[PDB]
């Protein structure tokens, strides 16, 4: 799923050095991105959406239940007229991407946080350089407005989601020559108000300066689409305890890269449950975070973990692997990882996995382990006392693995909270109704706005008409659509047309055809008694 955000604002009317405006260059770049992505044999399941800088009823051009034909037709007729309302457009796009999330089961907020339930989405937000306006002045903060929150959105406290990356294109093409071609293989950043918003999600922001640089950035962007598993790392709290082959001193601490969870839907178990201590009676649930604040500690702690535990291959995208490569990729050794923010009743973090590398030393495998592996792996009334340290709802998925061996547990203590189940079906129904109402009025514009609003300065109610583009005057049916110049000739033409008594008469003077004239479409409505047997 790819949602292209093209502003089509009035500031996108300035002409480049090639002769076309920035909007035409953006549309051409989108078309070349389409034809480049079509090369990879994986573009048979994705869906394209379009978002412009227009009113909430008119911002979306093609959303759910819209094929490629209507999407291309809407992107073709894009007009650059309006202000640069970036915040409202980003909010509308994020709400559109989060319409079918509370109904299928993604981010249920009650049963862990399953990383194998993915809904990838990439935003391009092709906008102008700077100087965004909000009908009052020029702002320099880019704060997303919060006026009408969706039902069930206060449990994340952030507009974007687990898998929602945000790339940006500014299209800073000069007007005279664009002769800046010193650095060949180098794509700098835009350094604008959208740069922090993009970096928070996990995607960079390109700075287009030349058509060659545009082609380079488009060819570099097609290689950044996969399953979205974005997790945040922190150096705390080990004081860079990497004393293995050298001495530490770094910027590879707050790594917020993605992870490629390739399927073999995705197959996996043992998710990151949450970051708080869930109580048995809690009417209000604390809001989750889109990026989990999980921290790693550099300790050997028996990296050899061999068992019949179901295996996972959530591949990690190499972005800050320099710190690992400095220590020879940690051969035959790993380092634990633990989620912060009160992972248990009374403690600060519980190691639930590690980041052991592969034998090929190519990337990090991201070995996800159970909540507390070094205890259950090595019954004398031990498991009954051990199952009290883990979160309650967490007994859900692990028991499935126990199904591979037997079934000692039951549904006696399989209860998260009596108040968490309530006020959940109503929120899901409200979200479904909102998604249906949004998908219903998605393409039907029905503007019907043509007036001059004649002010005084039949009274207080007059309004002069405006020039209608698609008027289609009926010359043979309506007599008012016949001007004075070609009146007598048109009169004789109408007379001859009425006195001819032909078959299948029409009221159009000369209606040649539409913009498209297909050969197969016209040849299908015919009959040819021939087969060419010879």
């Amino acid at each position: 799923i790819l949602l292209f955000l093209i502003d089509t604002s009035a500031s996108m009317n300035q002409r480049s050095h090639l002769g076309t405006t920035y909007l035409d260059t953006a549309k051409g770049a989108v078309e070349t991105f389409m034809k480049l992505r079509a090369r990879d044999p994986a573009s048979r399941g994705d869906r394209y959406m379009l978002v412009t800088f227009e009113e909430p009823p008119y911002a979306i051009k093609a959303g759910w239940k819209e094929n490629h034909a209507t999407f291309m037709n809407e992107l073709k007729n894009l007009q650059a007229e309006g202000l640069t309302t970036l915040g409202q457009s980003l909010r509308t796009a994020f709400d559109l991407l989060n319409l079918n999330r509370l109904v299928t089961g993604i981010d249920n907020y009650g049963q862990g946080r399953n990383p194998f339930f993915l809904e990838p989405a990439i935003i391009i937000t092709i906008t102008d350089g700077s100087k965004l306006t909000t009908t009052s002045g020029v702002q320099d903060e880019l704060h997303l407005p919060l006026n009408s929150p969706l039902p069930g959105s206060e449990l994340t406290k952030e507009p974007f989601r687990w898998d929602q990356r945000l790339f940006a294109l500014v299209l800073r093409l000069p007007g005279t020559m664009s002769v800046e071609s010193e650095q060949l293989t180098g794509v700098p950043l835009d350094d604008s108000a959208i740069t922090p918003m993009c970096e928070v999600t996990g995607g960079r922001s390109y700075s287009v300066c030349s058509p060659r640089m545009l082609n380079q950035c488009l060819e570099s962007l097609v290689q950044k689409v996969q399953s979205g598993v974005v997790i945040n790392f922190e150096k705390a709290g080990p004081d860079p305890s990497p004393v293995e082959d050298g001495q530490p001193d770094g910027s590879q601490p707050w790594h917020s890269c993605h992870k490629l969870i390739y399927v073999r839907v995705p197959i996996g178990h043992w998710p990151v449950p949450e970051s708080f201590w869930p109580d048995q009676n809690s009417p209000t649930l604390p809001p989750r975070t889109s990026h989990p604040v999980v921290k790693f500690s550099c300790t050997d702690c028996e990296p050899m973990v061999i068992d019949k535990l179901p295996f996972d291959k959530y591949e990690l995208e190499p972005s800050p692997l320099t710190q690992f490569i400095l220590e020879r990729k940690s051969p035959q050794t790993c380092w634990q990882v633990y989620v912060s923010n009160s992972a248990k009743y009374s403690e600060l973090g519980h190691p639930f996995g590690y980041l052991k590398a592969s034998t090929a030393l190519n990337c990090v495998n991201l070995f996800v382990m159970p909540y507390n592996y070094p205890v259950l792996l090595p019954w004398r009334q031990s498991f009954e006392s051990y199952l009290k340290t883990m979160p309650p709802y967490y007994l859900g998925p692990l028991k499935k693995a126990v199904r591979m061996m037997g079934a000692p547990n039951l549904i006696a203590d399989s209860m998260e909270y009596g108040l968490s189940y309530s006020v959940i079906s109503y929120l899901k129904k409200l979200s479904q109704q909102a998604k249906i109402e949004s998908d219903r009025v998605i393409g039907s514009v029905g503007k019907k706005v043509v007036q001059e609003t004649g002010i005084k300065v039949e009274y207080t109610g007059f309004q002069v008409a405006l020039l209608n583009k698609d008027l289609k005057p009926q010359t043979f049916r309506n007599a008012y659509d016949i001007p004075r110049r070609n009146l007598l000739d048109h009169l004789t033409r109408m007379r001859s047309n009425l006195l001819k008594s032909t078959r299948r008469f029409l009221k159009g003077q000369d209606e040649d055809q539409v913009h498209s004239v297909p050969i197969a479409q016209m040849g299908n409505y015919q009959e040819y008694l021939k087969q060419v047997p010879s």
């Binding site: 001059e452 300065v457 007059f462 008409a465 020039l467």
Partner: protein, 150 residues
Amino acid sequence: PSMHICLDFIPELIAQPELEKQIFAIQLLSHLCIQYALPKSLSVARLAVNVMGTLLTVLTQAKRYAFFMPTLPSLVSFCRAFPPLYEDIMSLLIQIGQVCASDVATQTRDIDPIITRLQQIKEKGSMDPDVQLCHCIERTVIEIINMSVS
């Protein structure tokens, strides 16, 4: 004598996206007001003055010239037929005049009608369209003054 009924579709003729239809409607209403004097005629004339005043700020120079060249004698006849409209018309004229005062000073000209402010009317060729519009406004104001004074 059956022309008064045309008033019943004079406003409908004004609300048209074509400037020629609006100009013809304004001229026809001007002639109907200089011929017939009725309260309905006064209301339609006031509506025409309003829609002409609101069209000054939504038309370009090339269209403003072509729309305000024929429609000034209409204002002259409106003043001749309806005294209470005088002020309004004057105000309107002033506005239009000031607009022309900003159109001539924009681009260089050949006659420079700005210094011609201290000139008098003399009883009774190819030039600039803005200068022609200024001269037409001045002439129509002169005719309105001569009609009201005499």
